[PDB]
């Protein structure tokens, strides 16, 4: 029931501390168009406070070259925080260093 709650509401953490836990994870899959579904499955989120006056994190950095799409970001208050993934980008899954 704990896993079901955390994946149904989006609050990542124990239910008893729901305000302390960060929200927004595990959103409802967008099912308007196939491109929308594909884009939603490939999305990175910066866990920095929105509505902030520091614009440095929101800027397009040089190191995004070939790994994060430069064109695709939401134009609202989350400009430069929610960013989509490049077409050939692959995220490492990790392995033992032994």
């Amino acid at each position: 029931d704990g896993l079901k709650y955390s994946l149904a509401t989006g609050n990542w953490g124990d239910q008893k501390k729901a305000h302390q836990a960060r929200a927004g994870v595990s959103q409802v899959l967008n099912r308007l168009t196939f491109a929308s579904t594909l884009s939603h499955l490939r999305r990175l989120n910066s866990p920095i406070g929105r509505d902030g006056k520091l614009a440095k994190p929101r800027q397009l950095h040089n190191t995004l070259w070939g790994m994060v799409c430069p064109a695709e970001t939401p134009e609202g208050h989350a400009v430069g925080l929610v960013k989509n993934l490049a077409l050939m980008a692959y995220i490492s899954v990790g392995s033992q260093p032994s």
Partner: protein, 505 residues
Amino acid sequence: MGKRVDFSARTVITPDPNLSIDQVGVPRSIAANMTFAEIVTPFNIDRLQELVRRGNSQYPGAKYIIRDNGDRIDLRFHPKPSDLHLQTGYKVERHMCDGDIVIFNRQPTLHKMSMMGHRVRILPWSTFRLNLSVTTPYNADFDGDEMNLHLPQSLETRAEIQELAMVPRMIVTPQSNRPVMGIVQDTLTAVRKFTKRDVFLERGEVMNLLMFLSTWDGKVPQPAILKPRPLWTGKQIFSLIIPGHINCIRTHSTHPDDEDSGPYKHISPGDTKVVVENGELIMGILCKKSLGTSAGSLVHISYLEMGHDITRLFYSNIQTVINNWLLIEGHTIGIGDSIADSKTYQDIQNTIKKAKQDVIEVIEKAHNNELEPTPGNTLRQTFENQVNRILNDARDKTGSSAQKSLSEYNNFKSMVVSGAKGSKINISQVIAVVGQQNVEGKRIPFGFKHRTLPHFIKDDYGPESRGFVENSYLAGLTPTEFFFHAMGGREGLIDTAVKTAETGY
């Protein structure tokens, strides 16, 4: 301080150039919902007694009838024939109808020209429709913008809105003693082309255009050319549009400065001094500077000398008659308007190469310690300043060359000269050179260690390696330039969101 209110609506807006500046078009569904309370009196007892008989089913009907008691009889749920009778003290809540006064606003209300009055006209489909000159104060765009409408519910507040906040009464703002509304978008461009010297209208085309003048006395003027065949002129008809006996002098956008000093001062070869005298256009070409929102324009003087009612008619007449002429003239933009003579491409290429060579030799001087710092500036600052100077000069020279290469028939020039849309730098960017991309005023920073991208050598200060885009939007951008351009546009997009939280506070 703010709260939800009743008798308000909200929907998508769409243009309609066939309404007056003081009218707004509303759907029947919205009109049939919203009601206004009319107090019965022996004058309107018959009209209201038929209106109550019609009921809430038909659109021109009533919804409620309020009695002297405050009792509220509802007509939409099986009203008895007994209590449909009404006396001289009752109130009837009738549907909003043609001519009702309403308040209209776009939600970011920054100044008092955002909440203005309008007269209601009922139109078939689901959108609010308002005349295009009223777009400028509201800052509307018709690109999906929503605007909302409040209905005055009592006679006292209705009269106050009519006598204080009507659109035609708000033409001049006290913020900068300039008019707020002006001719805008495709009338402005069509006016500049319509009032040129070499515009001649046959008899039939004149009779059609006069059909769209509300303030016309039914007297066809004597044509400027009689005998080979009767031909009128654009100026000769625009004079009929100008109301009263207005007198003002304006200069066109492309007026050369030296023309006034030498001869031909009062007989302009370029038709570029606007002179209106005794309410008649004598000479000159009307542009943004003549019909826009600048101080001393033809609409400003019209409002100052004549009443607001006459100025309102002036706005409506210009739009209708010029829009009907643009049906014949036509106006477009295409891929042919962004192309150059092959001569100008070679000139642009040579200029870019010379500028790039100039940056290279500046770098060579800097490397050999042969660069002397500017007094009050450091070695890095003066190097940056010199490089920026060279690149800016190159962009300006290329832009001027592209501007000179443009022909008379070019549509980019038609929109820039009239001031309807675009600027002189957009043409240069499309045709000649996009320019230099800047982040925080400086060039593109070294985001990887000591270089901008992994495609560049370490410590590469050249124009290509730091954000200069030597291609045009017609020739497309190289991948490195494309990424740098994205970096530049991101900065402006961020500032748009950040700025509002400070300005509103």
